[PDB]
Amino acid sequence: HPPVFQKKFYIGGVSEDARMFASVLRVKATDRDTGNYSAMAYRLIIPPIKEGKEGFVVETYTGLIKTAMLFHNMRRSYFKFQVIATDDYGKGLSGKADVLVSVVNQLDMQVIVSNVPPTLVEKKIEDLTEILDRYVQEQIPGAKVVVESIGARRHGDAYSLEDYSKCDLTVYAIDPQTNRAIDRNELFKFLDGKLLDINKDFQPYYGEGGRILEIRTPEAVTSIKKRGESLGYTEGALLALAFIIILCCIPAILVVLVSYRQFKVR
Amino acid sequence: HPPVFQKKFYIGGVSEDARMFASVLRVKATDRDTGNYSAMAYRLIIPPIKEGKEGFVVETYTGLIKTAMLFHNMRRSYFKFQVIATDDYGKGLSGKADVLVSVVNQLDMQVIVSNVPPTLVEKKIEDLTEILDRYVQEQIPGAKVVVESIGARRHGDAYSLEDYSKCDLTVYAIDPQTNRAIDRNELFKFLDGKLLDINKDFQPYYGEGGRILEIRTPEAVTSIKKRGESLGYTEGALLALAFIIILCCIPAILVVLVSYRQFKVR
Amino acid sequence: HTNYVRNSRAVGVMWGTLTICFSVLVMALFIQPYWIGDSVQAGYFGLFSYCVGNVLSSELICKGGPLDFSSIPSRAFKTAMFFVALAMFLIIGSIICFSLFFVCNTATVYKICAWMQLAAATGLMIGCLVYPDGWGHCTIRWAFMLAILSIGDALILSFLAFVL
Amino acid sequence: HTNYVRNSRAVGVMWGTLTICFSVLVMALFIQPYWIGDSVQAGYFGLFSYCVGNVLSSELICKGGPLDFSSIPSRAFKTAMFFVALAMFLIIGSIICFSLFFVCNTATVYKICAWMQLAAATGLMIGCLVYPDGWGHCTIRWAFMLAILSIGDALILSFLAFVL
């Protein structure tokens, strides 16, 4: 007998400098009645990719989707494929579903900062993403917050300190219609407009004296100005040489004009 | 009743630019007879770290060790701590064990290259590391191959291509005595001396027509020469200006010497 | 007209000095790494070789150097390279017309080097006009501005050379 | 002695030109980014500010610039900075002794600028000797080699200034 999916279209998304076989998500095609879904073999049906890439993989008895490709300078290479789940340890019947996965850069990142330790954040990240994608999908049904990395709060000397009482949370939702990565400013504005409604909700999750603080910009956005180089001073020295020598030659022209003029006079 | 560990000292190790909450390893303190070890709560006892770091974490009902700290320029900050496992969903008795974890750079990496697709490698990585740490611990009991990243084979234009028939495998073993990271050349030589003995062994694992090919050096070692800048040509232009002007002033000295000498003569 | 012949031989050896100064200036204009760049791709290309990359990428590869007469994309870049290389060899020949100063007349050699600096200013003007036709954001580097100051430089050198 | 006075006024305006050339040379020696570096830490420090980092690290921070008389570590670096800054202001004063050329005697102003270039060569010699005492691998950059060529440069300028 075939399994029963939770969502008929599971929804994924990864990043550019993500490593090989990173955690995309875990799937669950449930058994219908008996709950004997440990005999399920989650497998794939994958459309062909250039150069023979397998690209997106999954395990068998965990359902955890992993990656089989690198992303040197690739961007928004959105991939749709099929996933199956075979009953009877890979012998019974099956149902199939599809997954979209996007590949995001540093510029498709906005940090959520709250006033809690980050290990509690990564502990309760399931319910955190659950409450987010509960109160965000009223924008668009088809949005799914994809957590990138959960660090301590970057601040200080060129954003190189860590606050442990606070946290960094790197997220992005899903484009279900044009099916690609999402720029950081709509990532700001779709979240920031309903901030207090979810500040209500994290009291069984943050605890007490806890709330969402701010929605700020990552660190490598600042480095974009830094890698752009400019006019130095050695260059300016050579330009100053040219300006010096034309500044020398002009009075030479005028004095030799007066010279040949007085040569004509006397 | 307390659990039963597999090894009384579990052994870990991470890298420098590893991300937050990365897969260190999974622990297993087994139930002794009944096999009812789903009521085990794997928890920690951690010595204090500077600035209030929690640093190394673990989950509860999976045993998977994760990270709670970043590594801007840190190196060989080896950490020993305690781990517990409480019976009865966190109410029974416990046994305790310890874990050493090192933090390695790009320079503590050597790539294993074989002639197999990388997804089969990451599939059978358990048995791969098992056969490695079977036939390597005859060097030192206390060595544990720590796989960093499994990519396709870097070659081509400045090592920027991928071979899918072949594979990259970034490993390192463990220092159990001086308890720190291991440089790449002993990582080469401890493996390369018994290559054919393990080329025998991967025939149920690679399949047929498969063996270990070579033990080569990662890509970022080459970039170390590239970041070292040198004398340009604008610099050389200014030096040439100085050399020109001394080359002009020396015959001026000699001609004005002859000038004042002939002034003395006539 | 004693002070006027003082001025004559003075500005003659000034031709020598300032000419070899702009010889190494134009040679520096050749063997630089920076011609025209951009900061929004993200590249610091240079029309003989070109390092082109993307955002925050560390490793860059410039494609060229000692030419094969086919390495750079635009033939307009090849032709302007030939103009400015003729300007290079011209100013080396102007060092040679300084070397041929003591044999012939001053009014001879001044007209020789005058014809030289005329052709130098003309060829540099043409190459500087050719580059934007070979060509989309840009950040222009110091090469073209050094060249456009060298325009008026060789213009003033040729004007005072016609004066002498 | 007509050709000899030709030589006299010729090399006088040569003092003007080559002096202002080394004025902008020493000003370039000041406002560079590279003093002494190293490639095995991994840093490109510069004794007024210092960008120090490690292997393959992208972001660097130079610590200094317009000084506070306390920013740089070594007082020997501060004192050698004061020597070479006196050399800077000296060569600016040598542009001023070129500006005071038309009032007094030639033999007066040549001895003035001779005393100048004497003190310039002496102070640059002292600062170049001081830097290795302030100081472990190194890769020396082009600053010290430009300075050590400027040593013999100002030496030759002062020698021919004593000649004139």
Numbering used by the authors:
A (entry chain C), B (entry chain A): 1145 to 1410
C (entry chain D), D (entry chain B): 15 to 54, 58 to 152, 171 to 199
Question: Would you copy out the relevant sentences from the publication that reported this structure?
Answer:
Hair cells have a characteristic morphology and harbor actin-filled stereocilia ‘staircases’ in which the stereocilia are coupled by protocadherin 15 (PCDH15) molecules from one stereocilium linked with cadherin 23 (CDH23) molecules from an adjacent stereocilium. Upon movement of the stereocilia induced by fluctuations of the surrounding fluid, the PCDH15-CDH23 ‘tip links’ trigger the opening of a mechano-electrical transduction (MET) ion channel at the stereocilia tips. PCDH15 belongs to the cadherin superfamily and consists of 11 extracellular cadherin (EC) domains, an extracellular linker (EL) domain, a single transmembrane (TM) helix and a cytoplasmic domain. Here we demonstrate that PCDH15 forms a robust complex with LHFPL5 and that the assembly is composed of 2 copies of each protein, thus providing concrete evidence that the composition of PCDH15 in the tip link is a dimer.
We discovered that a construct containing domains EC11 to CR, named PCDH151EC hereafter, when coexpressed with full length LHFPL5 yielded a well behaved complex. Two-dimensional (2D) classification of the resulting particles showed distinct secondary structure features of the EC11-EL and TM domains, indicating that this strategy was promising to result in a higher resolution reconstruction. A 3D reconstruction at ~4.5 Å resolution displayed three layers of density: a top layer formed by the EC11-EL domain, well fitted with the previously described crystal structure; a middle layer formed by the β-strand region of LHFPL5 and the extended C-terminal helix of the EL domain; and a bottom layer formed by the TM domains of PCDH15 and LHFPL5. The resulting structure harbors an overall 2-fold symmetry, containing two copies of PCDH15 and LHFPL5. The density for the TM domain containing ten α-helices was well resolved, with some side chain features for bulky residues. Within the TM region there are extensive interactions between PCDH15 and LHFPL5. Each PCDH15 protomer makes more extensive interactions with one LHFPL5 protomer (1100 Å2 buried surface area, BSA) compared to the other (LHFPL5’, 270 Å2 BSA). We note that within the TM domains dimerization is primarily mediated by the interface of TM1 from LHFPL5 (487 Å2 BSA) together with the interaction of PCDH15 with TM1 of LHFPL5’. While there is a small interface of interactions between the 2-fold related PCDH15 TM helices (126 Å2 BSA), it likely is only a minor contributor to the stability of the complex. The extracellular domain of PCDH15 is situated ‘on top’ of the LHFPL5 β-sheet, but only minor direct interactions are apparent. While the crosslinking of the other residues is consistent with their close proximity in our model, the lack of a clearly defined periodicity indicates that the tip of the helices and the linker region are somewhat flexible.
